[PDB]
Point group: C3
Chain length 201, copies 3
């Protein structure tokens, strides 16, 4: 019976040791799971709330980049996120459209496109050169039109210049000058009549 | 021999105390870690499967909004997501080009841009008015064109109106009235010459 | 007291069974959080580091598609992600602009919009046919202009064709011919007067 009691104290002795062992083991198991759960929680991306209708990214003022996004189907009503390489595809066409539009306007203003054209501000204004046809027609719905601002053109045998009202007035003058001379001539004729009548010898 | 029993019992009492403490540490430590994990599990954004090739946002048929997204690099083949700021910039440009286009068509119609213009319905037509040069040329690949539809231009000393065919004709109808005049006097003169070769008195 | 011994042997056997139970408890509780975490670990989407400046999706080289994205706000400074449907809409507009730009250029180079038109390669070039007025004006900043390349207009009392300098020449050539007759005529008249002077019957 000395041996029964002795046995018991040994058992207790070992139990005490085991309890201390377990204590440290539990302390460190628990602290492990915590650190891991904690870091996951500190790196995981999260829905704002239970509805999951919004994710407000966690980078702060400068915000957060999302990279390695596969190109999203670009179709009517697609719910896929689009990347910068897809936005760039569009930015190229738009920038082209912007250019083609500027190039048109700075081509109409400086008159290098259209039927009526002029290469430089001091240049011959040309009307439908590259095309053919025999006729230019200036009439409109109010009727025919006067063509003004017309500087007089060369008057020779090969001239294609158009002529103006001053050049017409000049002609008109000659005519009246000549009708006058002719009238004088007729007078001069009447006189020769009377002289052949009235003379004697 | 007798005291040993008593001493064993106090040892048991403190052993039993410690087992209680441990059981109580464990329950609270694990309950705590299990909650943080639960919250984490419900709220975290996830990949659909182990390929990580897809994220189907959990917001139901309405979808999820992702925000505080940083400006993805807008470059060829970029894989950064792009936000609404960046799409808005393109959209303005598109509205810019769209509204550029519409107005270019309207004005070409309205005759308020280019070399030839006309403010309104009964406004005068102008040709190259804000530019220089001293020549308008209507020759095409078929050669010189007849310019027509021209209203009769004023005839006087400073008239810069072109002359039409109704006018040139008139001038000619005066020349044929002069040639008539000369024909008459040519005959009168011939008749005078006979009278004078014959008279005696 | 022998009853007391076995009673103590017994409670010690239970303490030992209970330390065991506790070692079982902790292992299965800890493994349980471990699995639940490792699963979270492998499918949660992750921030790259603690700044949360970047999420590099785990899809590998080909990438991750993000789907079920709700239309983001489109407005200056918006940090909402945007989806394929949205890019599609902008893409549609760009396409329409692209076509209209090219359609416009082609219409200019064909002579079919504006006031100066020509519905056919060998056709009547028309000026402001559809609108009205009575004025075409070709005067720039260098003053008035010489309209050239003008083919010989028709000459009759209803013609509305502009006449060129070569046709003016005809007028001024008849004119001289008139004067030459008038000159020879005047001389004949003087010859007649001097004849009436010296004639002795
Ligand atoms: Cl565009
Ligand atoms: Ni006589």
């Amino acid at each position: 019976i000395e041996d029964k009691i002795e046995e018991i104290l040994s058992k207790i002795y070992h139990i005490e040791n085991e309890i201390a062992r377990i204590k440290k083991l539990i302390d460190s198991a628990i602290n492990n799971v915590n650190n891991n759960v904690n870091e996951l929680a500190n790196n995981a991306v999260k829905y704002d709330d239970a509805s999951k209708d919004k994710i407000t990214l966690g980078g702060g003022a400068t915000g957060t980049t999302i990279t390695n996004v596969k190109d999203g189907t670009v179709a009517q009503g697609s719910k896929d996120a689009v990347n910068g390489g897809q936005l760039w595809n569009v930015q190229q066409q738009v920038d082209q459209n912007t250019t083609d539009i500027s190039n048109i306007k700075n081509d109409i203003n400086n008159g290098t496109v259209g039927l009526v054209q002029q290469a430089g501000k001091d240049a011959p204004v040309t009307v439908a050169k590259d095309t053919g046809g025999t006729t230019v027609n200036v009439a409109g719905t109010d009727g025919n039109r006067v063509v003004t601002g017309v500087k007089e053109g060369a008057v020779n045998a090969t001239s294609k210049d158009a002529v103006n009202g001053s050049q017409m007035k000049q002609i008109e003058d000659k005519i009246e000058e000549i009708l006058s001379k002719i009238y004088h001539i007729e007078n001069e004729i009447a006189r020769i009549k009377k002289l052949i009548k009235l003379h004697h010898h």
